[model samples]
Each structure stands twice: as C-alpha cells, then as structure tokens.
Target: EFNILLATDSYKVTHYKQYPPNTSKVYSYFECREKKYEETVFYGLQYILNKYLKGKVVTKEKIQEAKDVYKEHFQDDVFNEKGWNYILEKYDGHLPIEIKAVPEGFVIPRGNVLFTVENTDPECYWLTNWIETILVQSWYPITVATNSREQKKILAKYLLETSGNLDGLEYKLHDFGYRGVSSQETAGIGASAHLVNFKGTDTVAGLALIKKYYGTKDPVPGYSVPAAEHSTITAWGKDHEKDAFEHIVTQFSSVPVSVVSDSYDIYNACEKIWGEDLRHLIVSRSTQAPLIIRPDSGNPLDTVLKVLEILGKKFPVTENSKGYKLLPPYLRVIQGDGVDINTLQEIVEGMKQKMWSIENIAFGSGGGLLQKLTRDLLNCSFKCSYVVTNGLGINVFKDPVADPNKRSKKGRLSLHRTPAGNFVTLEEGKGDLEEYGQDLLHTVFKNGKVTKSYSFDEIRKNAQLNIEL
Candidate 1:
C-alpha cells in the first residue's frame, strides 16, 4: 500500500500538532547550499510531481492506516485525524499546496531558490512540509544531472581542442548504471538525469521514465547497441576466444557493437585475436560498423593508452585538422571499468598528450554515474522560510552560529534575473514582474493541478552545454 500518511518520517506525523497555535500557512524552499559546482541542472522535479504528488493521494482508508500505524509506532495519539479528515472533506483527498520551481533542465548556480512550496489552504499548513521526505529526494536526480552536465563541460573542451569539432558528442558518455543502483527507481531516475546531457544509456528504466513522466514524442530519449559482457566472451572457453570475437563481429556487423576484450588477456585479444586473426573481418567491416573495444581491467588510463596504441597500428589512422590522430571510423575504445569525473578527465588528457583525438573513445559509467552520490554531494536543503499565524504573516529563518553554511534564507522568496542577466534569489517578495526581469520560477503544481509540463526535448535544450566546434 502506498500510504500517503506513512510516506514521511515518523516525527513528521506529529508536526501538525507541534506548529504554533492557529498556524495558517507554511512556506518552504529547496536549494543546494554547497558550492561544489558553480551551476546545477535543476531537473527531475517534474517527475517527482507527476509520479508522487500530482493527484488525489489521500483517502479514508489511507487515513485509517495512518492512525493504526502511528498509534503503534509513536505510542501516543499524534495521528492528526482532524487534519486528515479536513483534507478528505475540504479538498476531496487532493493535497492543498502550491509548488513553484525554476524550470526543469534550467541550469542555475548553487545557493539560489530552485523550488518553493506552500500550503494553498490555510487549514492545510501542515501538509506543506509533511511531504518533505518524498520531495527532498529530488536531490538525487538533481545531483545526478549536475554531475553528468559537469562532465559534459569538461569533455566538450577536450573534444574541441583535440578533434576540432564535436562529432558524436552526445554518445560520449553511456549510462552503465543499471545494475549498480539500489533500486529500479534509482536507475530510472539517475539514468534519465544523465540523459539530460547525453543520449546513450544501458538503463532501460531511464528510457521508460522519460516516456512515461517526461512525455517524449520520440521512440526513446536514450539508446544502446549490442554489447558483450565477460560471461559472453569467457563462456566461449579459453581456446575458443577467437571464435567468440569472430561471432560477435559477424552477428552485429550491421551496427556498432561493444565487446569485453579483457577477460583472459586484453593485449592478446587486441593484438593477436582482434588485430591479427580477425583483422580482415574488423577492417573490412570498418565501412559498415565500428568494433568498440572495452578494456575492463587494469589502470584505466594505462590500459586505454595501450589499447589505442595497438588499435592505432591495426586500423587505418588519419590526423584530424588539429594534428591529432583519429581512429578508424569503425574502431573505437570504451573505458567502462574505472571512470569517474576525475579519472575520466585524466584519461582524456592523457589521450590528448599522446596526439589522439577525443573522438577515438567513449565512456560507460555504472557506480560512478549513479551510485557514487548523495544528497550532501550538493548540500541540498529544504527549509521553512515563511509562515502565517491567525491573520499575521511572518518571515522565518535559521542561522546556526556554529555553521554558517547551514544558515537558511528568510521570508517569501523569488528567483529573479538581475539587470545584468544573472540569477539571484530575492527575499521578502522583493522581485516584482516590472522591476527585475520576470521571475524564472513558474508554478508547476498548485491545488492538485500541474500548471506546467515539459517535454524531454525542452529539458535537453535547456541543459545543453554551449561550446563551439
């Protein structure tokens, strides 16, 4: 049972009783406090809204379940039966709240308001932050999107410097994070977040999420080609390794395919089997499809360099306009084993030093892309900034003397584009439509209705990194 009442922390169920007497409204906002990355790709809120908080979520049965669970879990009568019944009767089980957010895929610097939440109905003030446990999870997708985008910014420079053009840029990073995440939802959300920057993935759930929640008219937002793992290669037995390689090239000859070439010996596979034995098949088929070599073991940069050196001799090589070596159109390298933001850059720069074009390689990230992150990676925070009691409004904030980094914004907030064309979060309702450029925060959800929806293409466009070829 997806119990809305049980969707939050246990203490949150008691918050309705804890607020000041006659508390009529609560206003809160979500932001990333860490300056880890100068800009964060504000994404995945639309998926959260549509999947978890969009429709009539509360019901009489859900209320009963909450009462029973809380009575046993809390050892006290703090279930907020009156509040639940109030929502049930007044709003017909729909949440009474408004959520305004910077558009999904819009890249804004950290320490700015990304989204705000407030109770639309005064009586439902507790409902605003009550769902925080669920909403705060947006930090996952947001951090993933930001991580992937940062890599894009890093790789774009290397590609342009080495290759003199951005050929096959979107296919540079492939999501191999499907088996490394905690849940299917994590893979789905994180991979979809990665797709905001690249168009290649092995995570099927990510494609499903984009189609289902993000509303893509295309067949899919991301794609993958036939690839072989260790099992497929090793199962061919030690003596039949060459046969396994031959079979893969012949089977997927119509399209680019990736094969794990590090099972027994990466060098033997590259130099002897692929380079000498299957040379004709691989080289002749170069006009049809590239055979992507994956070195799954050893130091990532060292192995990639060795593989490129071997392949550089076996395949035809030409210098790009920038005097960097380009691999044959049908042969390339995919380093999937040990790639994170730092290591990836190391490998790319290492290639640059060797006179190899960045286009000669692609990367696949599993744990590095999806699992190696947490909410604190971006120091994501959601705090109450405004409230009202009875008839009076009040601005609320917290400033811890011990850690100023934990300090929060005060009053009702607005995200504005300053006259100089930068984003700034104004407090106490400072930004008006006429004075500052219009607030970028749009009402995405209000009173059980989605005021705005975005397509996957729109999100990709907003998050696209600007670079010259």
Candidate 2:
C-alpha cells in the first residue's frame, strides 16, 4: 500500500512536470504511469524530481495549466466507464507486498543473496518480479562504489609509502572503465564509487557527481597554479607531451614539470628531447626545478630503473654537476599503466631491493584500481526479506542458504569489533540471536515523507570512519 501510494504520487508529479503547459507530447496520468507508449521519460522524470525536489511546491495555476495543456493535446478515453474504474481502483491506492535487501553500498559476499521480497499478502507473489529490475539497477552501483573505496584506501596507503610523495596522488588515479561498463548510469555511479577511494577520474560526469556528493571544490590542491595544474597535464597522448611539459614550466616556472611520455616512444623521447634538455635546463634556466616523467606502459619497476640509469649516466655527478646529481631527487617517475595493489606492492618491494631512490617514483593507477574492483568483488548483494501485508506484524526474516559461506545472517545486523587484538574470530549464535543482532536498518522515510537527508560529504565521512576500525 505504501509503495503504491508513493508510486502514484511520484507519477503525478512527474506527469505534470514533464508534459507541462504547451508541450507537444500529451500524456494522461494513467498513460504516463503505465508507460502506455513504452516511454521511460515519465519514469526518469519521477526519479529525478522525487530525489531532488521533495520540499518544493507547485502552484495551483501551474497544475491547472499542465492539465489543460495535456487535455488539449490528447483525446479523452473512449473506453467504457467500467474499464476506467477497474484500472483506477486496481492500481490507484493499493500497495503490493514489497521486499528490500541490504542498503545499496553494504559489502556482502558472493553466493549470499542479499535481499528477497516476497508477497506478504497471499495473493500478490507476482509483484515480486516487477520490483526486481529497478531494485537491482539501483543496488549495483552503490556496491561498486563501496568496494572501490576500499581498494582506493589500500592503493593510497601503498602509494604514500612507496612514492615518498603525496602531493598529487589523488588526481593521479583514473577510472578508465566507463567505455566498457554496461551503461552510462553504471559508468557514472561506478566512477562515483571510485572517487570514494580518492582515485581521480577522467570521466567528466563522474567528477561532477563527486563534487556534488563529496563537496570537492575546484582549484584542486597540490597542483601547479595558473597553467600547470596536475590534473590538466596528466592526460595521455603523444601530442600532449611537449605542450604539457612546456606549460608546466611556463606557468609554474622553475617548479618541477611533470610529463606523461608514453604516447610515442617513451625511452627514445626521454633520451632525445626531454632528457637532452633536462640537465642543462635544470642547471641554467630553472636551477631548482627538475622534470617529472610518467610512463603509462611496460613493466613499471624495470622502466623506472632504466629511466633513472639513463638520467644518471647522462648527467654524471661531478663538482660542477653536484646539484645536477641532487636533481635526480627532484626528477620524479610515475608508473601510470597496469598498476594494482599486487603490482604496487611488487614495484615498491622491487625498488627497495634495488636500493633505488623511491623519492622519484610515484604511481598512477586507473583501470586496475578503479574498474577492476567492482560490486561483486566488494560483496554487495541485494535482497528483501520482509513485507507489509498484515499491519504492524513482526518483520519475518528470510534465511538464505544454510551453509556458513552461503548463508546470510538473518534479521537486522549491527557491526561491532572486539577490543584490541591482533587476530579476531566470528561466532554464530545458537538461537534467534536477537541480542547479537544489531539493527542495521534505519527509518529513512517517515509518515510518507523523507524526514532526514544525508549529504555526500556526510556519507564519505561515514565511510571513512567506518573503515578506520
């Protein structure tokens, strides 16, 4: 009953807003709600308007104008009066039994069905299938985002320790999987999830969502001022190499200029053009500034070592070149391609073994960190266990499979940790485990209204705090 009323109200608002006064497309509330023409415009409009415009009001004149316009554009129903009443009475104010699983971002494991919605009323089991598509679509991205955040945290820790510099690490991580995802919404949501890990993304739409959700303002920190901001220069391509490097020098003159050299021949370009100018330019024009290079392809450890060796030999340390020797400290190398947690760990370990100056080596992971860690990997599943048929009945819990690995803990769960211990264990309760169970679900809506709202920043902070333990 609740869902039906909500859906109807949602449809009403969507119908008026989308086909307002004087619009060419005329749609009745009934047709719009039912999707008579196989149009999802009404559906999408409802989602957006409902999400963003809860407290706002539409004037009476505006409502009448929309109705008049719609009526003028479409023919009145010629069907029998009995048919109209049956359709209206059937759908207008009746709530179907609905089920919801865990909240979207919850980390659930594979083989554990997260949620299941069965008809509470004996007659409405068929309604279960109708809710699945929208529920699944809504649930997956949250899972992806939550998991990506975890992966980001791991990568962030690795980079901070290995690279010895945290200046531009945030923007260096990219989400390169948008083109490969199932749809544009998934891309946007997945990118948003990756942002939780602090991996910077190239997807413009994802960035906007991050800013909207996470309160990320522009003039991003640790980047060059005016012309050489870190975000602008890190773009890949041969054509961008010279211009990006020179721009860094021109704008933030004398500051270390970072360049992505993998677009053409990385080794050749570094040895010939950029490498040729490195020593002299650092010594003469920009004495304090050194160049930072990023290689987006090949084995990172070997490439970093090779680049360092070449730079070292070209500008051999001597009395006159003593400062130039120290310049290697400023000559940073970033490994952008094929970097993941394992690869990052390996590269860091390798650098340690070789006794190389890690101060010059940074990491820029895109697909490996962002796209690979998806909703499934993070243990995000959707399920709905109970519904409202008999009013005020105790919520019935659905038990998943019986095996420990496959079964979901029944009823609401609260997460708690044991006090200060190096190792931990999980114990299962023998009975209903009400004492052990923590109520994870909260009343997000009250009295047919959203009583509270959480900003993206709040959610991010909550995520950070939750992981800290």
Q: Pick the candidate with the highest lDDT.
A: 1
Q: Model 2 over residues 262-347: C-alpha lDDT tens digits? A: 66677865776566754455434443565566676777778876776666666543322112122244455667677766676677
Q: Candidate 2: where are CA atoms >4 Å away?
A: 1-129, 138-143, 153-172, 176-182, 211-258, 282-290, 312-330, 357-359, 373-375, 387-405, 408-438, 445-449, 465-469
**Positional deviation of residue 461's Cα in model 1 after best superposition, in angstroms:** 0.8
- Tell me how far candidate 2 lies from the true structure as C-alpha RMSD in angstroms: 11.9
lDDT of 2 at 393: 23
TM, every model: 0.98, 0.57
Candidate 2 residue-wise lDDT at 61? 39
Q: After superposition, how far is residue 460 of candidate 2 from its true place, in Å?
A: 2.8
Candidate 1 lDDT over residue span 1-469, tens digit each: 5777888988898888789999988999999985448889988888888877878888999999889888989787888899989988988888888999998999899899999999988889999989898999999999999999998877898998997778788889999989999998899999999999999999999988998888677888988889999999889898899999999989999898899999999998998988899999887765447899999999999999999999888777999799999888878889998688989999999999999889889999999999999998898999999999988999899999999899999899999887788889998877754578777899999988889999989998899886731
lDDT at residue 429 of model 1 (Cα atoms): 75
Candidate 1: 10-residue stretch with minimal lDDT: 429-438
lDDT at position 347, candidate 1? 95
